[PDB]
Design a protein around this ligand. Structure first.
Ligand SMILES: Cc1c(C(=O)C2=C(O)CCCC2=O)ccc2c1n(CC1CCOCC1)c(=O)n2C
Ligand SMILES: Cc1c(C(=O)C2=C(O)CCCC2=O)ccc2c1n(CC1CCOCC1)c(=O)n2C
Ligand SMILES: [Co+2]
Ligand SMILES: [Co+2]
Lengths: 382, 382
């Protein structure tokens, strides 16, 4: 059931912003590892004396990497005279964030009809304000409220090209990499207490719970009206056999924060071929693959959806497969993106639920906990 | 003239350590951009609860990338019980360094006969101590004194594999990249006042001035007995037509620090081919090339050293050429390595001064200031 209770008009995920110590090195690493093009910048060369911000794009996916300059470059500025292109940016906040959490997501940005209205309605409905609505060049409005931990939900609305003050990138510096990634499917937070986190976010958005179907977690998914903005939240389950990965996250992250970004591919086979080729030459590593018993067991579960060759391709790439009552999910997880065992990336492709494809088709793979455990002792039984 | 006045036995450059906010992303970027292999690690997976440290190697060149974890992971430790593999590491120092300077070199490490003796003699001769000698697993001794700004000169001595507590890397994660870089040729600092910086460092090392042959700088080079450890220092020259690049460095870096690392290649043509192929796909960018008049003028200057084809190869790659009374230098400069216009890399190859090749053969390229200016108006004169 979907009561379509959004308190303001929400469109799609717009961008994800990482707060970095050095935006250049993280952006270049991510560009090569994920096949994303350098498409916009705001930095010293564009007159920004406050922060360096670099935008990578792949299809509709937008990753922004931002780091602070020395405060001395802008010590004469005040907010009315700022050269920052993102007016919510604060040197102290950014340094405190990265010192506390390491490299990670500061902002989950969604595009809305009216960011000023979204901010006002959110705050009237319990949202903790983080940065008030600000109109940029009479063309774009940005506002921010707290989501969880030090992560903010950023509202962006356009009157009618990323943000004013950003410049399109050089072409020589813009190599057209593309491994098939096309959009953000969902963005997942880890918190100590799921109940109060859900109540808070659902309280100020009107997002509804997305229906599902002990591994150390309890989770729930909040969804917009058309279920294209999907914000799952996890809490740890304590006392289990193996220590909860959610608890490890909270310890190494110094509390709640964004756990994973799931990136939809239009061809997950190509994406994983291209990413795995680059794992050991600057790109991303992937978790250890399931045993061959898992891919043996795929015939009975999804043999009506994938051929033997397509299943063999999944086995070659370490891809996981789950199924809803509506659709099928192909997914795989990277190792952590940086030094800490905190944020990682999921690559996904969904098949089914054709109307366009409806959001969340096939679920989020919670069935793969049983099937992985079921595969593990099965391969031990050889 | 070389008075060979070293106050302790110095061998060669040993490693360069960058202090990072996220060591993983910088190390992976540098590995791909420079063709260096991942060869050792010290991090959570090796029992280090304090810092993540990753070592890249190319030939004898060793780049170490280090970032701090949350202090909470090690809050129960004291120095006698530390799990840090580099005992001089301090969370607060590292965070303060990166917040002040951004990504940059913390340590220039040289191998010595006896790091305890080098430390004692240095401090008795005016060196400001930074970290006292500490013996690691009864096998290696490390000590540190201040060099300039927040950069330290690190002494390392071995009784008889990088450092104890580091583990050799996985092989699957160790891709054998190699673009031809083989060793560190020199490491250059920028300071506000050259005189007092030279007096200080030469005072405690016994390093002697290396002889040379207004562009915004004055410089001088300090050298070990066999002139294989070379430590140039620059100061700005104020009031010039174009603003001094040394002054821009000092402003954006928040004071003195390491300006550039010069990396010797055994085949600078191959190195630059390989690095330029990767500039726009995660690697490093190079400064704009000199005009063709520069390569025209190369025939009269070095036509006895390089063929027309070899000169044409220099022009294809943007390589600069200078000449001493003893040797010839091929060199090129990267754009800044990170967000700030501070640290950059030089790639070099030297030809001549055969005995092995003597250190500093061909100088450091100061002649290229005249020849570049001479080339610029010449190409304007077309
Ligand atoms: C995170 C995750 C998902 C997943 O994406 C997901 C959501 O989007 C919504 C909430 C429910 C959910 O579970 C699916 C299956 C998984 C899994 N993990 C955890 C590890 C995977 C790699 O290492 C880091 C964590 C695992 O073991 N299996 C088998
Ligand atoms: C730094 C540099 C060197 C060089 O390496 C060097 C030393 O090792 C020892 C001290 C003397 C010295 O000059 C040689 C020639 C140069 C040069 N620069 C500065 C810019 C180059 C690219 O952008 C950043 C700075 C330039 O314009 N020319 C023509
Ligand atoms: Co997921
Ligand atoms: Co140099």
């Amino acid at each position: 059931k979907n009561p379509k209770s959004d308190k303001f008009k929400v469109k799609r995920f717009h961008h994800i912003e990482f707060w970095c110590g050095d935006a250049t090195n993280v952006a270049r690493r991510f560009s090569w590892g994920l096949g994303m093009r350098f498409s916009a910048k705001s930095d010293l060369s564009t007159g920004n004396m406050v922060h360096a911000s670099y935008l990578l794009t792949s299809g509709d996916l937008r990753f922004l990497f931002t780091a602070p300059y020395s405060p001395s470059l802008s010590a004469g500025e005040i907010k009315p005279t700022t050269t920052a292109s993102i007016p919510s940016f604060d040197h102290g906040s950014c340094r405190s964030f990265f010192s506390s959490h390491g490299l990670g997501v500061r902002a989950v940005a969604i595009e809305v009809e009216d960011a000023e209205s979204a901010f006002s309605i959110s705050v009237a409905n319990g949202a903790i304000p983080s940065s008030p609505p600000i109109v940029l060049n009479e063309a774009v409005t940005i506002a921010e409220v707290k989501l969880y931990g030090d992560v903010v939900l950023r509202y962006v609305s356009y009157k009618a090209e990323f943000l004013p003050g950003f410049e399109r990138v050089e072409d020589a510096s813009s190599f057209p990499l593309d491994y098939g990634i096309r959009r953000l499917d969902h963005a997942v937070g880890n918190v100590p207490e799921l109940g109060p986190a859900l109540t808070y976010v659902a309280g100020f958005t009107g997002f509804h719970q997305f229906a599902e179907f002990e591994s150390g977690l309890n989770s729930a998914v909040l969804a917009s009206n058309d279920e294209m903005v999907l914000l799952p939240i996890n809490e740890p389950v304590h006392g289990t056999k193996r220590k909860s990965q959610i608890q490890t996250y909270l310890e190494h992250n110094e509390g709640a924060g964004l756990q994973h970004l799931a990136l939809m591919s239009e061809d997950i086979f190509r994406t994983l071929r291209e990413m795995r080729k680059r794992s050991s030459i600057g790109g991303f590593d992937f978790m250890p693959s399931p045993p061959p018993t898992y891919y043996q067991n795929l015939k009975k579960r999804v043999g009506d959806v994938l051929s033997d060759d397509q299943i063999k391709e999944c086995e070659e790439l370490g891809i996981l497969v789950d199924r809803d009552d509506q659709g099928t999910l192909l997914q795989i997880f990277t190792k952590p993106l940086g030094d800490r065992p905190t944020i990682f990336i999921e690559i996904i492709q969904r098949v089914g639920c054709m109307m366009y494809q409806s959001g969340g088709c096939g679920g989020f793979g919670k069935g793969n906990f049983s099937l992985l455990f079921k595969s593990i002792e099965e391969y031990e039984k050889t």
